[PDB]
Amino acid sequence: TAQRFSNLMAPTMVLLGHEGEIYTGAFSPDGTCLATSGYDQKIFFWNVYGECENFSTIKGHSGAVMDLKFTTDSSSLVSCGTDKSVRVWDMETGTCARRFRTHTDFVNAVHPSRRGVTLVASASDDGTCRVHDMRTKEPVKTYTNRYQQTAVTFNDSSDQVISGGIDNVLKVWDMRRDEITYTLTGHRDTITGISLSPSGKFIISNSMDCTVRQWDIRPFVPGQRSVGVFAGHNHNFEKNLLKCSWSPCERFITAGSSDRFLYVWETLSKKIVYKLPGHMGSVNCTDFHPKEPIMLSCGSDKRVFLGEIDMS
Amino acid sequence: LVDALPYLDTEYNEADRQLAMKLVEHECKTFRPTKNYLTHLPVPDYDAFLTKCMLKEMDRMKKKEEMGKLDMSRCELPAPSAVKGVDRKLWAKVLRNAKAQNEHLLMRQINLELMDEYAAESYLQRNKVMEDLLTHAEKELRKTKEAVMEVHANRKMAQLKAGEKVKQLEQSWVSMVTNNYRMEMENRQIDSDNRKQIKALKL
Amino acid sequence: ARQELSHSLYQHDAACRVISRLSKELTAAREALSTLKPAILAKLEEKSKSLTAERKQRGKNLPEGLAKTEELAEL
């Protein structure tokens, strides 16, 4: 006998069915489902429990899918891809509720607003950070940068948009000012992903310099906003936009890694305590199940791994 | 509520012990032993089971009266003398005692001769059982000493495992209190926007 | 053993009074942090010594008109 920690059927699961290189994956906030996609363009939905069967698959994308996030109420999935389009999928219907189309170059990264009106922040290789609204064809805000943007998030109040890119430094725009209120400086190479903390106080940002840097985005900080740096993961010559994600308890942080290992760090000490093998290629995305200590990781090896951990 | 955790509260010192009991001293200068603290125990029953005879045997040693002793001078048989031997009772005492002592010595001889056959073995047999008792008792002593040390370890393990989480939260808490008061001063500093609004109203 | 246990419990009880008083002082101090925003005496002894001294004759002898126990038994 051995210790168990989740309702998974086995302490790790191997999900097979993809043929494309899986570039993104996220859980539904209700914990019932996860959705995963990448170069196959098909978005695969999986149940979290039991046989974890691939109950649904959505086509419709025709350029590979960079990033994919659920809306907070789990009514819709927002996903974006290199077809220069942001597509919002109704979870009950499995159909494209909105197809935002004003980007001029590949859209790589997406983040829905947490509450209030449903807004979708997006960042692209045209250098624009754009916030779309479900109710209008035209976007609400377009913030233009000289250099391509490949990561985006709102803050928790959904009134500051944080975008990172080729600049390494970060264009953080405040939606009442339409100005950069501050920049976060420490990244020596491009920013492959940004994820907002559950409470919204912090963001982690992952970069091709092989570090994750934790930033305090609260309105007042008396000094430098850099809280800490995490290392151990690696970015290879593929230059992927390796993502990052928070644990819902905030005590743990994850990032994609080219060395096949699933990294977990302790937020305060920045030490590693989980280094989980099993992948055969670049782990492009990693996420925590929102209610249960299940780790999701999606890799360039065409495989999705579910596994349970002792989150302490 | 007593909430001491002696494996976590390691900063406690004998100098603090003196200080703490001084505070209890100033308490017990006024706080007095007035309640019956023993009401969870029964009333004692020092004369249970004893007979009316044994109660008197308790009373004499409660009085610290000396224990009475048998006169064993019969074994030495004090000699009579002719100036006292005029009474038959003296000779009837002496001679019958002399007959009785002859049998006590005779039974003593039989006992000693049997003791000379069997005491050397039965004493060795006794000592072997006594060694068995002692090694069993030392086995129990070793077992319980390990059990006592395990309870110390379990307490230390539980208290220190909680203790590190206390240390993390306490360090976190004082940082927030200092930060929140700073934000109170900052928000009242930004209330200098009244100066802008008055200037903006009366340009 | 019963004598020493009574003393031990007395000392522990007295210690709990100190714990309670100090625990409230700490709570008030931590509350202040958590919400931090920017001849009378001579007369009495004179009167008490008068009162307690006048008693001393009554303490030596009770009134002769005091109702007896055998009378109070017939209330």
């Binding site: - | 206390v166 808490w173 927030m176 929140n180 | -």
Partner: peptide
Amino acid sequence: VGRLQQEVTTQETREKDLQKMYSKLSNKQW
């Protein structure tokens, strides 16, 4: 621990209220 968790949580709600004030105030100064 229960004492400290309540003490921590009292400040966790206090700081969110104070930062909403700071955002409301600092967004008026701009």
